[PDB]
Design a protein around this nucleic acid. Structure first.
Ligand SMILES: Nc1nc2cc[nH]c2c(=O)[nH]1
Lengths: 324, 381
RNA sequence: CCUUCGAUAGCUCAGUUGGUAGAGCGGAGGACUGUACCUUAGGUCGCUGGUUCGAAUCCGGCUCGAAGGACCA
């Protein structure tokens, strides 16, 4: 399997470059929400030497995804020649060629193609949706074969269809035949058993030479169910939600606690015993409780370090679990 | 005759600027030195390793701020402030008083102490000098401060404040039995006038407290009368005792106060450059790919640029706020190192001319107070 | 080919009982001189045409759509 380092506008949330160097287990590929990279495309259009040197992380590979999974979107707002991106920029009329200019400026290693048909959030309308989602991939493959560094960049395909069985089946079948690097599963936001066996059939319909991705699914038990149903890569927007509400994850990978209860203000133990993050290494849980009481900006950083360390350690554990 | 905590091997010729070493129970601090406030450092999210990486040696604390929460008894149980915010070096605790929190949030002042309150309505207490020194014994710091009567403010109220500070220093000395584990400083009051201030200086030079501190100045301070008070105070005191100063953070204020003999000085999003303050919210150099200062050894310049933090400043706000604030503290530390290194090279008139012309363009554009004080101490620009 | 609905700050939307515009997420200016943030700009409300003193609000049509039967599978 695998995970993507969830970055909001270049760097990790509440983490600087030195503090990212403090985190253990950061992947070599970093997710970039394309919505936060609207004006960044202009800056990189007249920066002209890549985004890795721009943000200060050129040694890592990059991935661009259109949807920030913290703000995924409604039951349907996407169009079938454009994808609106939830975040800070890219609503009206984002063409495939606009995406071509964006990926030329960013120069990502991988990039997610566009999509339509969010109704899973009947037959013939899903046929139209799937045909348009193939029109996107055809346009991307036509406009990708031109430039050499863009020829070094890799298309990732999108599977659509909705809750319908046969239409998403034929979406997988007729989207597989294109010469594409990888695949995405879309419209699977929470979870029901209907989408579960739809996933089970559709990932069985796709060839086994390509990676599978998904959006809007990061809670660990749905991660385990999608791993056993056929998804390779996941986003990491769940520990951001854990830290945003002021909680800290506690489940042993190898659930969570709200520190605003008064019972932990005497303990000298860290949040997780034996945790190798910075917060558990030096600080105590009483101080985290204390600074959450006064609502300052430091416990967000310490907790955010702890949640990333725990959550990427969970991904390390599930990579090693299927390895054995 | 207490042993002196300060030693000096540095004497400028054209000026009276000084540079020396202070021994404290967690290390040695080079005078002059700047001190980031611990409340705003904890508020702006710089961790322990990021603040220690710049080379800082003194941080700051308050009696009130830990007394309200998490409680003096919990802090005393854990030997709090050095194992709590995890500051491995020495720290100076401000005793507090009539700060920006005042009678809109304070309470009645009686002889025994000053009553402190909280948004917690049941948390109202009476901060007595014995109470304050008990709390500051519970904090376990390295330089404790006697309880102050801060004024901005002129009149007989300042005379009452300085007399009451003399009496409260007597109460503080007679209260605690730690003259050797921790060092107690004495706040010299006097407001904006020099006669009651002068007899106050005489009064606690009769007292044998190891440290002296000028207080009650910043907030409504005019810089000419400021440097005049600093000069007369530093002339009055013996040269083997340190002179803490309050509320000095700007660069020219700091360096000219070093020229007069000081040794201590002490919302994010604005960087500090050798040409001054550079607010990084500016869209005027949002396309600049150079570092903030090409000579600054802070990690922000050497790894990042200006365009990247311009993008990051409000999007993921916490990380860019961290970057900006650690750059500011690194700049202040490098400025102190430059001033001390120039003074040890006996180049300080030339150095003050040099950076004066650097961050002011020419001697004609400089403020009158810096030129006036440097000419008075004996340095021409 | 037909039926219903959407297009609003850079982004999500409210506002649709018609009053040209707000909230949040994002930007910009300042203050940070011993700490229980302030101020401010930006959006021809997709296009075309119409009613009306007046549209974002209502609509014929176009583009980009979404749902559904699909002129075609
Ligand atoms: N120690 C100390 N701090 C402050 C902060 C404002 N005024 C003062 C003062 O006079 N003394």
């Amino acid at each position: 399997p695998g995970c993507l380092l969830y970055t909001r506008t270049g760097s990790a949330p509440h983490l600087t470059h030195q503090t990212l160097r403090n985190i253990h287990g950061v992947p070599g590929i970093a997710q970039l929400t394309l919505s936060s990279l609207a004006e960044h495309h202009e800056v990189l259009a007249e920066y002209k030497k890549g985004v890795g040197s721009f943000i200060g992380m050129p040694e890592s590979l990059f991935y661009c995804s259109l949807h920030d999974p913290v703000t995924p979107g409604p039951a349907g707002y996407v169009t079938s020649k454009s994808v609106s991106v939830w975040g800070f920029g890219g609503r009206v009329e984002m063409t495939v060629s606009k995406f071509m200019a964006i990926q030329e400026a960013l120069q990502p290693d991988w990039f997610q193609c566009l999509s339509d048909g969010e109704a899973s959030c009947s037959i013939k309308r899903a046929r139209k949706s799937v045909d348009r989602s193939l029109l996107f991939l055809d346009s991307c493959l036509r406009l990708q074969e031109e430039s050499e560094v863009l020829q070094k960049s890799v298309i990732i395909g999108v599977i659509e269809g909705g809750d319908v069985m046969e239409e998403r089946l034929r979406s997988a079948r007729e989207t597989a035949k294109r010469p594409v690097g990888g695949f995405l599963l879309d419209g699977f936001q929470g979870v029901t058993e209907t989408r579960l066996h739809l996933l089970s059939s559709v990932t069985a319909e796709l060839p086994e030479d390509k990676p599978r991705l998904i959006c809007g699914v990061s809670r660990p038990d749905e991660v385990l169910e999608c791993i056993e149903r056929g998804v390779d890569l996941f986003e990491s927007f769940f520990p951001y939600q854990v830290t945003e509400r002021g909680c800290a994850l506690t489940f042993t990978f190898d659930f969570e606690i709200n520190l605003k209860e008064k019972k932990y203000q005497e303990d000298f133990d860290p949040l997780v015993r034996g945790c190798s993050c910075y917060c558990c290494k030096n600080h105590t849980r009483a101080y985290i409780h204390h600074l959450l009481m006064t609502n300052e900006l430091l416990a967000g950083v310490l907790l955010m370090m702890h949640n990333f360390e725990h959550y990427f350690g969970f991904f390390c554990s599930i990579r090693e679990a299927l390895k054995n | 005759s207490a042993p002196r905590i300060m030693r000096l091997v540095a004497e400028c010729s054209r000026s009276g600027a000084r540079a020396g070493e202070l021994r404290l129970p967690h290390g040695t601090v080079a005078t002059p030195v700047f001190m980031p406030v611990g409340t705003q450092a904890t508020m702006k999210g710089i961790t322990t390793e990021q603040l220690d990486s710049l080379g800082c040696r003194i941080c700051l604390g308050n009696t009130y701020h830990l007394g309200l929460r998490p409680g003096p008894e919990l802090i005393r149980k854990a030997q709090g402030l050095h194992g709590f915010m995890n500051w491995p070096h020495n720290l100076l605790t401000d005793s507090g008083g009539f700060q920006m929190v005042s009678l809109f949030s304070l309470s009645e002042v009686t002889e025994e102490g000053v009553h402190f309150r909280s948004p917690y309505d049941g948390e109202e207490t009476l901060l007595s000098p014995e109470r304050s020194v008990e709390i500051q014994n519970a904090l376990g710091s390295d330089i404790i401060m006697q309880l102050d009567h801060v004024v901005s403010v002129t009149g007989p109220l300042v005379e009452e404040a300085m007399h009451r500070s003399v009496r409260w220093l007597d109460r503080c000395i007679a209260a605690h039995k730690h003259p050797d584990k921790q060092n107690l400083f004495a706040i010299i009051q006097g407001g904006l006038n020099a006669d009651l201030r002068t007899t106050c200086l005489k009064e606690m030079t009769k007292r044998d407290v190891p440290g002296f501190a000028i207080g009650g100045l910043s907030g409504g301070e005019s810089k000419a009368q400021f440097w005049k008070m600093v000069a007369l105070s530093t002339s009055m005191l013996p040269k083997d005792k340190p002179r803490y100063l309050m509320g000095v953070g700007y660069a020219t204020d700091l360096v000219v106060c070093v020229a007069l003999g000081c040794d201590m000085f002490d919302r994010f999003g604005s960087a500090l450059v050798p040409t001054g303050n550079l607010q990084l919210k500016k869209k005027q150099y949002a396309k600049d790919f150079s570092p903030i200062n090409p000579e600054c050894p802070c990690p922000t310049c050497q790894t990042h640029s200006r365009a990247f933090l311009h993008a990051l400043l409000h999007s993921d706000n916490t990380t860019a706020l961290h970057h900006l604030t650690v750059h500011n503290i690194a700049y202040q530390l490098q400025l102190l190192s430059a001033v001390r290194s120039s003074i040890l090279e006996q180049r300080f008139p030339d150095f003050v001319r040099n950076f004066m012309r650097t961050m002011y363009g020419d001697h004609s554009l400089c403020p009158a107070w810096a030129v006036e004080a440097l000419a008075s101490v004996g340095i021409m620009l």
